[PDB]
Amino acid sequence: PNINRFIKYLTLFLITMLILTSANNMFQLFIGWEGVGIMSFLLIGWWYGRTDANT
Amino acid sequence: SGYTPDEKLRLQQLRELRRRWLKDQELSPREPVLPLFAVSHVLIPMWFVHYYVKYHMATKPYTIVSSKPRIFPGDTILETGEVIPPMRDFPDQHH
Amino acid sequence: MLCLGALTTLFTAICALTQNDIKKIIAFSTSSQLGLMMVTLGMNQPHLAFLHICTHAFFKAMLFMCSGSIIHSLADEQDIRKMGNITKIMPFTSSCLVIGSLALTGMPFLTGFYSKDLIIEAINTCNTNAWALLITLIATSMTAMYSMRIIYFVTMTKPRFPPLISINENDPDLMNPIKRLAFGSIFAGFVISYNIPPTSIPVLTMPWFLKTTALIISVLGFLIALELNNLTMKLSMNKANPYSSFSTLLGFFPSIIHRITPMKSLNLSLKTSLTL
Amino acid sequence: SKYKPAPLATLPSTLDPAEYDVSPETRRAQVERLSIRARLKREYLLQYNDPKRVSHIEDPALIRWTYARSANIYPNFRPTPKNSLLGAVAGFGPLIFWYYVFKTDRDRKERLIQEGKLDRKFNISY
Amino acid sequence: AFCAPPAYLTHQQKVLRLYKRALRHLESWCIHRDKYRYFACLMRARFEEHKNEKDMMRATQLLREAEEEFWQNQHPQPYIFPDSPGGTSFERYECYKVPEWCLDYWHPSEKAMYPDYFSKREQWKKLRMESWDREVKQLQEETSPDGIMTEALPPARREGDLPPLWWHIVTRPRERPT
Amino acid sequence: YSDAPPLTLDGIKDRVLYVLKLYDKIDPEKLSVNSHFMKDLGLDSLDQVEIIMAMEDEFGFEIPDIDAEKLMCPQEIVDYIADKKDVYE
Amino acid sequence: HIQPRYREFPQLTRSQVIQGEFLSSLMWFWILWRFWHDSDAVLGHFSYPDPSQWTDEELGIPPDD
Amino acid sequence: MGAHLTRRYLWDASVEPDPEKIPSFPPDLGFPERKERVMVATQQEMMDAQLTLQQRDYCAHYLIRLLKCKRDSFPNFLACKHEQHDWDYCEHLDYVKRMKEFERERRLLQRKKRRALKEARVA
Amino acid sequence: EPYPDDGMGYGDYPMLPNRSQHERDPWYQWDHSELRMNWGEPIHWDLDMYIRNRVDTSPTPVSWDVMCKHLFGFVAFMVFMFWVGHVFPSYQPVGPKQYPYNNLYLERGGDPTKEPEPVVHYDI
Amino acid sequence: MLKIILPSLMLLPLTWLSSPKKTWTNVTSYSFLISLTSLTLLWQTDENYKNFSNMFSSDPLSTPLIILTAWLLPLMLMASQNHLKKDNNVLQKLYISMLISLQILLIMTFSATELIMFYILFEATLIPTLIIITRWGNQTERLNAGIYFLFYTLIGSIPLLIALILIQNHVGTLNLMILSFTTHTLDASWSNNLLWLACMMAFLIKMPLYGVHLWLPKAHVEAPIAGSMILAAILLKLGSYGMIRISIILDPLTKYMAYPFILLSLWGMIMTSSICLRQTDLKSLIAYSSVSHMALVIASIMIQTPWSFMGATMLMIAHGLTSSLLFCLANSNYERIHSRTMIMARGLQMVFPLMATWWLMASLANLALPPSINLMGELFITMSLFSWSNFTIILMGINIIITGMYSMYMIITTQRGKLTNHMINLQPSHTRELTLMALHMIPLILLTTSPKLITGLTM
Amino acid sequence: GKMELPDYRQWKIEGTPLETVQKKLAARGLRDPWARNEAWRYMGGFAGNITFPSVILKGFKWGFAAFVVALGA
Numbered sequence A: 001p002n003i004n005r006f007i008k009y010l011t012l013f014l015i016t017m018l019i020l021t022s023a024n025n026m027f028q029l030f031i032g033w034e035g036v037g038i039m040s041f042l043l044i045g046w047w048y049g050r051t052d053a054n055t
Numbered sequence B: 001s002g003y004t005p006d007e008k009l010r011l012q013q014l015r016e017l018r019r020r021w022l023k024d025q026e027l028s029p030r031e032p033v034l035p036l037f038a039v040s041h042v043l044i045p046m047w048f049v050h051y052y053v054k055y056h057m058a059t060k061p062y063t064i065v066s067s068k069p070r071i072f073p074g075d076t077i078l079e080t081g082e083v084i085p086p087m088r089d090f091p092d093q094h095h
Numbered sequence C: 001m002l003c004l005g006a007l008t009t010l011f012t013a014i015c016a017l018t019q020n021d022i023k024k025i026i027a028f029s030t031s032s033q034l035g036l037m038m039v040t041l042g043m044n045q046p047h048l049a050f051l052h053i054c055t056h057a058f059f060k061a062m063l064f065m066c067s068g069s070i071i072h073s074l075a076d077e078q079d080i081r082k083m084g085n086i087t088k089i090m091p092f093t094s095s096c097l098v099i100g101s102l103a104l105t106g107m108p109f110l111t112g113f114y115s116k117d118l119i120i121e122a123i124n125t126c127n128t129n130a131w132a133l134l135i136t137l138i139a140t141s142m143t144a145m146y147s148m149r150i151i152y153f154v155t156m157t158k159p160r161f162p163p164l165i166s167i168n169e170n171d172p173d174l175m176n177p178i179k180r181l182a183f184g185s186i187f188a189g190f191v192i193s194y195n196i197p198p199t200s201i202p203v204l205t206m207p208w209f210l211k212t213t214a215l216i217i218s219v220l221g222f223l224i225a226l227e228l229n230n231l232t233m234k235l236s237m238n239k240a241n242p243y244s245s246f247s248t249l250l251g252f253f254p255s256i257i258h259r260i261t262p263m264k265s266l267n268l269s270l271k272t273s274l275t276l
Numbered sequence D: 001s002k003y004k005p006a007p008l009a010t011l012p013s014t015l016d017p018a019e020y021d022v023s024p025e026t027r028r029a030q031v032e033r034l035s036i037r038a039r040l041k042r043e044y045l046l047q048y049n050d051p052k053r054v055s056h057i058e059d060p061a062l063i064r065w066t067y068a069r070s071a072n073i074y075p076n077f078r079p080t081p082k083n084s085l086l087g088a089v090a091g092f093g094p095l096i097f098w099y100y101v102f103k104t105d106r107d108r109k110e111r112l113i114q115e116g117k118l119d120r121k122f123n124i125s126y
Numbered sequence E: 001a002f003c004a005p006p007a008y009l010t011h012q013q014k015v016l017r018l019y020k021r022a023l024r025h026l027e028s029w030c031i032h033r034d035k036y037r038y039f040a041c042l043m044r045a046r047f048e049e050h051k052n053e054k055d056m057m058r059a060t061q062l063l064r065e066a067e068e069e070f071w072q073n074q075h076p077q078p079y080i081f082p083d084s085p086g087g088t089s090f091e092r093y094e095c096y097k098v099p100e101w102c103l104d105y106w107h108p109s110e111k112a113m114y115p116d117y118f119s120k121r122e123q124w125k126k127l128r129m130e131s132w133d134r135e136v137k138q139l140q141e142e143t144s145p146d147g148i149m150t151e152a153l154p155p156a157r158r159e160g161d162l163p164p165l166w167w168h169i170v171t172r173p174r175e176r177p178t
Numbered sequence F: 001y002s003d004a005p006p007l008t009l010d011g012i013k014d015r016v017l018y019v020l021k022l023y024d025k026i027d028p029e030k031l032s033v034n035s036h037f038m039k040d041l042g043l044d045s046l047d048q049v050e051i052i053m054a055m056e057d058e059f060g061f062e063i064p065d066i067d068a069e070k071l072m073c074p075q076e077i078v079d080y081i082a083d084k085k086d087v088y089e
Numbered sequence G: 001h002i003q004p005r006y007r008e009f010p011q012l013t014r015s016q017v018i019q020g021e022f023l024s025s026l027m028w029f030w031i032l033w034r035f036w037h038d039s040d041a042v043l044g045h046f047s048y049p050d051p052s053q054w055t056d057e058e059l060g061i062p063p064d065d
Numbered sequence H: 001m002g003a004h005l006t007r008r009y010l011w012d013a014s015v016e017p018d019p020e021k022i023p024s025f026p027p028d029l030g031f032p033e034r035k036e037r038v039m040v041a042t043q044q045e046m047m048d049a050q051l052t053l054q055q056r057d058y059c060a061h062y063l064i065r066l067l068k069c070k071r072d073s074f075p076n077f078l079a080c081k082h083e084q085h086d087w088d089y090c091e092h093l094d095y096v097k098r099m100k101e102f103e104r105e106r107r108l109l110q111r112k113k114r115r116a117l118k119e120a121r122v123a
Numbered sequence I: 001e002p003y004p005d006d007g008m009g010y011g012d013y014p015m016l017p018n019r020s021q022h023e024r025d026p027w028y029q030w031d032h033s034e035l036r037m038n039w040g041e042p043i044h045w046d047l048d049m050y051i052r053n054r055v056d057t058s059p060t061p062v063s064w065d066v067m068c069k070h071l072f073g074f075v076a077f078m079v080f081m082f083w084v085g086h087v088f089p090s091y092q093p094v095g096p097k098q099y100p101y102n103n104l105y106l107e108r109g110g111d112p113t114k115e116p117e118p119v120v121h122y123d124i
Numbered sequence J: 001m002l003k004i005i006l007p008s009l010m011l012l013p014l015t016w017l018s019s020p021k022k023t024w025t026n027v028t029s030y031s032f033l034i035s036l037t038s039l040t041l042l043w044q045t046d047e048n049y050k051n052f053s054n055m056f057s058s059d060p061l062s063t064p065l066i067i068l069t070a071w072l073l074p075l076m077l078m079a080s081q082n083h084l085k086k087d088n089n090v091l092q093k094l095y096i097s098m099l100i101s102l103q104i105l106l107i108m109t110f111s112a113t114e115l116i117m118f119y120i121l122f123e124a125t126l127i128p129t130l131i132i133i134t135r136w137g138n139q140t141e142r143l144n145a146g147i148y149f150l151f152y153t154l155i156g157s158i159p160l161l162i163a164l165i166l167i168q169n170h171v172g173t174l175n176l177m178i179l180s181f182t183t184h185t186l187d188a189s190w191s192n193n194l195l196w197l198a199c200m201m202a203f204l205i206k207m208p209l210y211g212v213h214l215w216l217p218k219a220h221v222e223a224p225i226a227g228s229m230i231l232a233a234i235l236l237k238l239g240s241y242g243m244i245r246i247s248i249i250l251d252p253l254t255k256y257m258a259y260p261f262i263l264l265s266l267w268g269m270i271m272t273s274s275i276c277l278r279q280t281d282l283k284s285l286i287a288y289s290s291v292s293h294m295a296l297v298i299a300s301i302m303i304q305t306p307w308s309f310m311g312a313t314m315l316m317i318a319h320g321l322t323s324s325l326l327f328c329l330a331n332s333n334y335e336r337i338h339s340r341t342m343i344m345a346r347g348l349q350m351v352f353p354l355m356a357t358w359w360l361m362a363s364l365a366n367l368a369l370p371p372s373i374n375l376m377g378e379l380f381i382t383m384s385l386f387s388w389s390n391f392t393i394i395l396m397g398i399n400i401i402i403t404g405m406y407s408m409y410m411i412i413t414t415q416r417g418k419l420t421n422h423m424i425n426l427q428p429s430h431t432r433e434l435t436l437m438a439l440h441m442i443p444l445i446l447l448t449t450s451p452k453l454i455t456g457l458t459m
Numbered sequence K: 001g002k003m004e005l006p007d008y009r010q011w012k013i014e015g016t017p018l019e020t021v022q023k024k025l026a027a028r029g030l031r032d033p034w035a036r037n038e039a040w041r042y043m044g045g046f047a048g049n050i051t052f053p054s055v056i057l058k059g060f061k062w063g064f065a066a067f068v069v070a071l072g073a
């Protein structure tokens, strides 16, 4: 029922991933390093209802 | 075992009601009553970026720096006009 | 990191051999390949490590979406145990799966081959831990084994999926991308290797068994595994070795370090730091 | 190999001797306990399935839990040994450990800076 | 999930529920089918014999050594179905199973569309309040003399009465909301 | 599309009937919904376990133990499967 | 409209088979084409010297004594 | 992997070289006026071709050629093939050297063991 | 069975079996579905740790000791073998690589003014 | 700075004189504009601090706060329109005025040149706060909580009173400007070693240190939402502002008299962070989150390196906004749920889709996600702490791992999982609830774009 | 469209690997009752044995045919 949100997070993941790729100062590298971590959290547990996905 | 004769009726009846609930869940016709472009987002974004990169970045100091171009032996330098000396001859032809 | 990359390569690969979940096996392979990537960084060969990252992306992406196709086409069955003979029922994904499988096993002249054997022979030629050198090579044979495990169980076997069959992969949205990546998986190693800047000054001079070691170990890895897959079909009980379960439950790092740490880290807060 | 329950990885239901018991007394409890649960179950199930209700089903078993855990603690505190020895090792133990971890480092650093060895190069910040 | 848990388990249900775990944990070892179907009719044999043991003591001594044979000869990754507890899709679609008492706070605009839907929903809510009295009374008039009490609830037993405590077994959020 | 067509009861009904018609012990020409397993067709306490298991593998889901110690009639299986899968026909 | 099949081999669409043979056949054309044009998978193209055939003059092994 | 290791690790290492110190003996030993290596490229040529320090080998000169024919001939990445063979050869012809040097050091160490015993005349 | 009277606060709170909600029958219709706890049943003192998304105490096909020993054995053997390795490394029969100039003294960023002791490399 | 203050006072006449029905909008609308006048202080086009007049000054450290103090009064009055909408029309106008006086007093305290002006106004803020907590507190225990909040601050306060009168005699004026440009160097006696403790202890108490922080968990638990916002966002930071301006004097002793607190705070940071990990009351967990993230601050206002100080200034403003956001959304769950328990109310995103987005962003602010001022702050305190002793990363390294765990657990067990079966049905979200949040985060997004404004005095 | 189902009779154990399992089970005296259900696995379409070279070599025939032609031109 929520295809659009799923596609939205996938591109946000790509934006953080590419920022992580092309980052001169490491503060930006950190923005990418933490950034993919949080959206992975949002996307691994896409189906929040399932506790297994939450774990 | 086998269902108890009084549980094969509480499942008899409640299943009958679940079937009606799911029928009622069905939407009637009309139920939902409501009351190249490619260039668009590739070209329009581009003009802006260029405006930004050729008139802010380029203008400001050390904003777009590049590794020196590669110059090999025997290839000319356009800006100064010099011709890179050809290298010492490779003596061996052994493959 | 040469050392830990090496341990993860085999540790993850051995775990993958007995895992019965298709997505899980591919994921362990993701870790095992990166273990090889960690090994090259550990042997101070940065440029080739990056080359594997790019080639790794094309084929691993393929195999996952290949299983995405199998899982979605079947009634959401994510277990190799109930999935069989996809080769005749769904040739399009099976073709994509074996293309990806061979790339994962470093088939000669495919994208894995251009970058992967450079890394293998790099190991065979550098000064390195003997334990690391031996594990990385058998890790390569295991990559062939679990690769063999997936196609034998998932593709070449009598079907074992639920009786009603409703399989469709015709949707352009399935084929097209799978088709496009397949083209990348077939030609990318050719294109990337020639185009990149000369780097690392590789050592192409080797005794022939080291020059061809990656090729042979990959070949017998499948050979030995095929013997194994074949063995099962018999009406004789093999089950598995005592260390097999050790392998199947992920080396027991999950069973033990996930129940003790979260238990002795929370008990101390509630019982000791918070209330006491 | 016999399965060996540990405080974790406990003895499964099967493999548990108690499960294999029909002593009429045991069965007595096992049928008495369902009653408590059935009773409680038929006190949740016709109060949650009650039309005409807006109030919050309370689940007092959870209210007895929080009170027991944050407001029934200090009224049941009696200072014994194994409680004050262990109630001082926890508050002052590490707090004294790290002091000799940080003092020794800070002192090592200071000495080295004083004698002129610490490089402090390209460090223009702090 | 539907029927209520019995208090104690019999001998039978313990034996007959091993025949399931066992045979189902034999189909993880026997990945193929012909091997399985073979190695399994051999399993029944094991249960088939020692079927008529009348010596309870013995029977509960074959059972207790069966479930230890099994515990040590089980597969670590059993084949557990996709949608069952412990599975791969367990509770996946629960993020879409809203509890149906939430369509009661919808804005009169939202419920404006979807018109006939709420015309039938208001009928069912009339059914629910129209019987709570006859139901609870039934639940009570039929409270068997105080004693053993199980979670089993009574059927209807009279026309027009709706088999009780039914509003949440019927009106359950649909399994696959999709 | 990818997801198969939803089960219609009169189908699920035939599917459960069918599988039994392939169990050798259960006569293929008598299996009649409402023909209890242990009282009419003659199966034993241990067969039922299997008959259910076949169904769990024909329809791809697990009939829990407690709810499956009672799939006696060859029909209870047809409404229980459907009720668990939300088929209102 | 693919029709779900019960206990039968799912019918396959023209395209499913052709695309599948296509991707696989190109894989094999590429492996064969490169093998012919560039067979340095085996031997590289530089032969290992036998380190044990180097005349003692070659390495500076003085005449013992 | 190899036998050479077995010699050093198994058996005795007395006569097996230590990789950390390959030119362990006198460089001139064994050679009157041995000629030193020679580099075609120029300390600058390399610096202008931005060759990675590591790639600045005695084959740096054939590399610069490859790189030349790779920038030129840009759209065609499959045509600077002769240049790569050459570089590689140069390097194979260097790996061999590095192997000849290792074998020479091996043998020379043996000379020591032989001579010691020979020179270790009983009396 | 009241928690032991050692005055750490437990009070009268029942000492319920230390088993995680993980092995509570996963099919039964638990009033509170996700805590797998019914309405009224005494909650466990540490139900903030036994919750499903946290620690588990669910019987394991392999005995716990057997697990701890095996895992760490593997770890140790590996670590050790890696040590056997560092002791006996694998290195081809190749002498050291030879860089031009003075091991690229100046280019490795060496001081231009101070020339280095020439490091020369000879043929063969 | 009497526009940020006089117009504020006039709010009180407006809350009283205005119609019962229109009292809320006149007050909230006007203080939004009062915040707009507050923004003028940010115009510093030169380093010289802006000494408005003899008693009133604003330097980089105070200015970022005065604006926050003015900003929250609007928000506080918007978060308490629900509860406090069941009152008698004269209990409201008292609550609104109480909230108004807090920022009048707090604006002045943060904008005060004379340190004892700080003390009188500093300790006055307790009167308005204690009334907000005790009079309108829902739980039976607020009488107790109020006592704890008054005594811990008061026993600390009288030592500071003696100390500041003491320095006035020793130096001759408590004017922060002069005290700075004058030679006040303590002499490491045993007595001075006490003076230092006298001045810092009162500030260290309201900035919960590990030893004396029990007042804050108890106070925020039963305090109404407006009181909990004020305590976390502005009240606790009063202690930090005091430590920055008071340690200008007592310059030599803190080099060696700080170790005790620094270690108390860093170990405290770990234990306070950890008990958040298993605390059933959500307001309880946010409060201990507040203790730990404030324990970092007392460990940067004591190391005293330029970066620490502005790490502190960054984190204090940032954590202030984040904490309120967390306390504000906790209240929205509390009012529909009617219980503070974290375990109940599971699955809300399924029923309150957006509040969950606000919950997610608040948690990411709570943990250190990088394009946020919250992370810049911790990254800086972390750096200096490392400089003090490389080992500090271990303890400031166990806190980061724990902080990630409790921040996400609040999201995982409150805003995900299966929905609670049938608690009193949860009415949809009001637009006020959502704005009260949006008003907290939109400024957090805007400040993160240009961190320079909240960097402190040091940089 | 009220999907039909293949005649139950169609399935038979002979001609499939189940038959050999059936015969050895018969040697023990067991009857292998549910073997008929597991027949469509081996019954038809999916009846042919799949060999590992066949999958690895799928399309090799044309692939080489394509290679030869290209090599010619």
Ligand SMILES: CCCCCCCCCCCCCCCCCC(=O)OC[C@H](COP(=O)(O)OCCN)OC(=O)CCCCCCCCCCCCCCCCC
Residues within 6 Å of the ligand: D100, D101, D102, D103, D104, D105, D106, D108, J391, J394, J398
């Ligand atoms: C959890 C992750 C832990 C990661 C640990 C990483 C450790 C890296 C190595 C640290 C220890 C060696 C440092 C070596 C520096 C150079 C040598 C030196 O002189 O040390 C500096 C200084 C003096 O140390 P030392 O030489 O041992 O002299 C002691 C004299 N009595 O050092 C000192 O000031 C004295 C103390 C040195 C040893 C300190 C050990 C710290 C232990 C931290 C435990 C972390 C867990 C605590 C519990 C958390 C859960 C509750």
